[PDB]
Amino acid sequence: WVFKGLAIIIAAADATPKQKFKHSFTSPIFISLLKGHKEEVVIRNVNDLKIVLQALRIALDEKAGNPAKIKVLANALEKKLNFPGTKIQLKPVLNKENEVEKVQFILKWGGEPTHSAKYQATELGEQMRQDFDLLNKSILQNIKIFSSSERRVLHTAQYWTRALFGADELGSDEISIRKDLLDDSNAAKDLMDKVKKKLKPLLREGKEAPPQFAWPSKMPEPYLVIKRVVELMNYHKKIMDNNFAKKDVNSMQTRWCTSEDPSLFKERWDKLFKEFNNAEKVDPSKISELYDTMKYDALHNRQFLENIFDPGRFMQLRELYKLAKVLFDFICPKEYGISDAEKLDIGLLTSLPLAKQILNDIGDMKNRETPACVAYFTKESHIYTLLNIIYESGIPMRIARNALPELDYLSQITFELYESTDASGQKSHSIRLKMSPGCHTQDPLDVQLDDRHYISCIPKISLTKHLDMDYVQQKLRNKFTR
Ligand SMILES: O=P(O)(O)O[C@@H]1[C@@H](OP(=O)(O)O)[C@H](OP(=O)(O)OP(=O)(O)O)[C@@H](OP(=O)(O)O)[C@H](OP(=O)(O)OP(=O)(O)O)[C@@H]1OP(=O)(O)O
Ligand SMILES: NCCC[C@H](N)C(=O)O
Ligand SMILES: [Zn+2]
């Protein structure tokens, strides 16, 4: 076998925690924000956000909704609309006459690439440049690059491209944005809500029997884990307030940087403490937010994390990190489906266009005369969903899904093509699928980092051996029907 092509899907590099407030309103002033649209509307322009802020202040005075919940939205928008990455999503709910009866107001902020992202992307670009210059130098001449429109994703694509070609500047003709392929799609959101509601009793209610729900034996039931996290969160809230109120906070870390100062720290945790103070109220969506900030602070605000939660790897803190990782490893992946059928549909509804694109590119690479590579830089969601398509296709795998490592920043899915032009002109092809969990550490509270705050990438692990190409395409294309 000899290498012919590579189709590699790459997730975004290190980024700031993603946070969101979501509330639904039916009052006309909130419906008018859609401006007649009956599909999801995204607002990013800062001036449009200032207009919405004014609308929220009107809504508050008019009591066009829960005033307390409108206040938090308005105050959060006012503070964050001047920060890159802040956007508003308006999801209309249509009645039986295709009339908007309700709109979901989602305020999102964060998710920006950190200063560390460039190291992870550059590391990957240099390693792959090395790899290609040892397999076939001609591969560098046939690179095709796609990217999501999300800022953290394109940031990753740009530094990877610079490292791969060894270049400073870069033209817009080299990276092609494909929103249809690599951005999130609300196509599966109708079915992901069915899943989200099925998870709430598991985490809140004292006893709810799950069918086909992976969970480690050494851990108690999920609702107990939630109750202990709430206890740990309420515990750390009191420590943090006591330390802010009493001690000099500006001396709890010898060096502060952009996005790494105690005021932003308190803002993030104040939100999470509010959302993790009642086990019977915990939203499964907020487990990922809790774990994302915990990764961020242990990675970018390590010293302050120690000192502001010091009562006087702290044991109550290590316990909190360990329990949060369990919830993120066995609850968050199942927002993309609990049962195999759910993981399959949701996986298809989300990433079918990308999946077809990969197979077609793989199909083209067989027929080429020159070796090539196609890199897809994608939002986090497509990696989860695409792996589910791989397993639920019936393709023989080398490792089971439950055994797969936790997906982290810059995790990759790889489709390696090898051609068999031997046996006369008869040309056969084998495809081997590999993945990497990205830049991950299993001991975030114990690793010692320098000013780069940079986690190295984990080498790839093989999901399959060399499989007949025509076989691997049929098993995938058989599931595209439903
Ligand atoms: O208006 P919505 O229906 O679009 O959104 C509501 C819905 O959220 P979700 O569907 O998961 O997105 C409720 O979930 P759910 O399980 O009851 O599902 P259903 O209500 O049957 O649809 C949720 O109640 P819970 O999960 O805590 O029990 C409620 O939270 P909270 O603020 O405490 O308000 P109240 O519960 O005190 O009224 C939400 O109100 P918003 O603030 O407007 O978002
Ligand atoms: N129509 C459902 C898929 C469309 C996708 N949410 C998009 O706007 O790209
Ligand atoms: Zn940092």
Author numbering: 537 to 848, 924 to 1093
Article excerpt on this structure:
Inositol pyrophosphates (PP-InsPs) are eukaryotic nutrient messengers. The N-terminal kinase domain of diphosphoinositol pentakisphosphate kinase (PPIP5K) generates the messenger 1,5-InsP8, the C-terminal phosphatase domain catalyzes PP-InsP breakdown. The balance between kinase and phosphatase activities regulates 1,5-InsP8 levels. ScVip1PD is a phytase-like inositol 1-pyrophosphate histidine phosphatase with two conserved catalytic motifs.
Next, we replaced the catalytic loop residues Arg547, His548 and Arg551 in ScVip1PD Δ848-918 with alanine and obtained crystals in complex with the substrate 1,5-InsP8 diffracting at ~2.4 Å resolution (ScVip1PD Δ848-918 RHR-AAA). Notably, the GAF domain adopts a “closed” conformation in the substrate-bound structure. In our ScVip1PD Δ848-918 RHR-AAA—1,5-InsP8 complex structure, we located a crystallographic dimer stabilized by an intermolecular disulfide bridge involving a cysteine (Cys793) that, in apo structures, is part of the zinc-binding site. One molecule of 1,5-InsP8 is bound to each monomer, either on the surface of the enzyme involving the GAF domain or near the catalytic center. The GAF domain adopts a closed conformation in both monomers. In both binding sites, all phosphate groups of 1,5-InsP8 are well defined by electron density, with the 1-β-phosphate facing away from the active site. Conserved basic residues from the GAF domain and the α-insertion domain contribute to the formation of the outer substrate binding surface. A large network of lysine residues from the GAF domain and from the base of the α-insertion domain forms the second substrate binding surface, which is located in close proximity to the RHxxR catalytic loop. Most of the basic residues contributing to the outer and the inner 1,5-InsP8 binding surfaces map to the central β-sheet of the GAF domain. Comparison of the outer and inner substrate binding sites in ScVip1PD suggests that the 1,5-InsP8 substrate may undergo a ~90° rotation upon entering the active site.
